[PDB]
Each structure stands twice: as structure tokens, then as C-alpha cells.
Design a protein around this ligand. Structure first.
Ligand SMILES: [Mg+2]
Ligand SMILES: [Mg+2]
Ligand SMILES: [Mg+2]
Ligand SMILES: [Mg+2]
Lengths: 159, 159
DNA sequence: CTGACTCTCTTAA
DNA sequence: GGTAGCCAA
DNA sequence: TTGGCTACCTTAA
DNA sequence: GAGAGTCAG
């Protein structure tokens, strides 16, 4: 049964999967702030990343910078992100370890997938949701605090 | 599906599961050397460990020494170890990341279960298989090298 | 504006 | 993610 | 001899 | 496990 196989992935994602939304300051972007969603799984054994990549028909594999002979399975473009999300909604309910992260991650991805960040308030909202997301993880951090980012969005608006 | 749930576990085990066989020098044991098999999964989210434990009907949960507020799901007694192994043999075929570790782990666990370590040569073989196991691991280590352990067994045999 | 490659930072395995 | 010490059972 | 709680060591997430 | 820079597209 491949249901078992899909249980393998979801189980694998709960253990070593990663839902992240970076904030990149780009002057030519609306609001002067960009949100960049990135789902990924790191692994020494390139093999498993290959299966998953093949069973989901999305994402790419690479060498993890700074850690030679280690690989990262990544899926970040909007199109593949939707498929990824489509996939997880199916079992989201049994998601134990990372249910919240995903839910918050989906909310942001979809939000961008619906151009919510195309207006000031919309952008501020997603940015806030990104910081909430960080609060959910142990290994995450932020270069600048929320108010700082928000004050940059306001500066841009005055333009 | 209970099958999907079984895939969640196997996937979880491949990512963050642990198959270990410690060597402990105990002067009153046969060969002066003991091999101690331990399967375990560490996790901050105690919840997920509770499920797995409740689903495998075996193992225990504890806080992880040195890492307050982090938990470890451990299954090490011979009885539970067999059930654990019985479980994994089922899907052992699809195991990608840790297939070898398990196979080598099982060989040792079983070997002790059948008292193979009760005769010198038998004990020596399992000890060797343990070092092979460490070779398969990235985060493992040995306090003493193999020849040293083997020379302790020989010393004890003279007595 | 988004894609994606390069690089950086943290700790739970 | 993996080892090893100890002492009771 | 094995159980299992305590303490220690490493890096792949 | 997770965040940010840069520049081509
Ligand atoms: Mg991007
Ligand atoms: Mg792993
Ligand atoms: Mg034991
Ligand atoms: Mg891990």
C-alpha cells in the first residue's frame, strides 16, 4: 500500500522537514519588503530526498552550503508550493509535531499566492504571521525585530 | 488508514530514529564485556513520542539528560526489542536511510536473544558487528578500539 | 515582482 | 543520534 | 546475566 | 532546521 508510502513522507517531514518564510529587504519591491517561502528537508542520504522528490513530482535537490556531502530537498516556487500544500492538507489533521507551522506557513504562502502582500495592510499582516511562525520553531531567528521591518514598510509607503 | 500511520512511524524512524549497541565493561559478565542494544527517538514534542509508544504498545518515555524539556522514546528490553524488530521486518524492505543499521542492529539483538554471546567466539562476533554498526553511523563513537575490547575478552577467557 | 543559487545562523537530534 | 557507568533485580 | 536510570559525546539537521 | 543577499528573469 502506497498510503503507507505517503505516511512515510509525512512522518519524515514531521521529523526533519522545514517550513520557513524569510524576509528580504529589496528596494524595488512593493513595501520595500519581500517574504520568501521555502519548504525543505536536509539529509546526508541523498537517496531518500530522491524518492520524495519523485513521489511528489516537485522540488529540486542540491548540496547544502557549508556542509559538503549533505543535501537539501527544496520546493519554493509558487506553483510547486501549492502542490506541496495540496498534498499536506490531506493529512494535516494527523500532523502532530509541525501542524501549526504548516498552517501558518500555508496561510502565508496562499496569502502571497493571492497577492495579499500587494497592499500595505496585507503585507504587514503576512510579515506579522512570519514572525509568529518563527516563534513556533526552535532553530529559527530574525535579523531585525518586527517593528523595524514594519517601519520600513511605512517608510516606503510615504513614497 | 492504520497502514498510513505505520508509514508515518517508519518515516519518522528513518529521520530521527536511533539504533545503538553499547559496549559496557562489566567484570562479572561472561567475557568481561556486555553489549547493550538500545533503540530510541529523541524529540522536543513529547506528544509524537506518546503516540508511537501507544501504537507500538512498547517502550517508555523520559526526559533527556542534559537537555531539559526534551524527550526520548526508548525501547531496550529484550522482550520489547523483539516486538520492535517484528514490526520493522515488515517494512524493512522499503527502509532507505537506516536499512543497514537496522539489519545490523537486528543481527546483534537477535544474537543476544539466542544467547550467542554466551560463548567466546560468539561474543567476539557480536562485538565486531557492533563496531561495523558504528561505522554505519555519523554520530556514533567508541571509547576503546575494537582490538582493545577483544583483548579484554581474551584476558577473561584465561581466567 | 518572483526564481533560484549562494551564504549564514541555530539546536534538536 | 549514539555510548557507557552503575547498581539493583 | 539483564533492567533501566544516570551521565556523556557527536553532528545532521 | 531556518533565515537573508543578490541578481537574473
Ligand atoms: Mg523565493
Ligand atoms: Mg535523520
Ligand atoms: Mg539494556
Ligand atoms: Mg534530526
Amino acid at each position: 500500500e502506497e498510503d503507507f508510502k505517503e505516511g512515510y513522507i509525512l512522518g519524515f517531514i514531521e521529523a526533519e522537514g522545514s517550513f520557513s518564510v524569510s524576509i528580504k529587504f529589496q528596494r524595488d519591491v512593493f513595501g520595500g519588503v519581500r517574504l520568501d517561502p521555502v519548504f525543505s528537508i536536509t539529509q546526508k542520504n541523498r537517496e531518500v530526498l530522491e524518492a520524495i522528490k519523485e513521489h511528489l513530482g516537485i522540488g529540486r535537490i542540491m548540496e547544502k552550503a557549508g556542509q559538503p556531502n549533505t543535501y537539501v530537498y527544496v520546493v519554493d516556487n509558487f506553483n510547486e508550493l501549492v502542490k506541496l500544500i495540496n498534498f499536506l492538507n490531506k493529512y494535516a489533521d494527523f500532523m502532530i509535531v509541525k501542524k501549526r507551522q504548516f498552517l501558518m506557513f500555508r496561510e502565508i504562502a496562499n496569502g502571497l499566492v493571492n497577492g495579499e502582500h500587494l497592499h500595505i495592510n496585507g503585507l504587514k499582516r503576512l510579515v506579522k504571521l512570519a514572525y509568529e511562525l518563527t516563534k513556533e520553531s526552535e532553530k529559527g531567528y530574525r535579523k531585525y525585530d518586527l517593528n523595524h521591518v514594519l517601519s520600513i514598510i511605512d517608510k516606503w509607503d510615504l513614497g
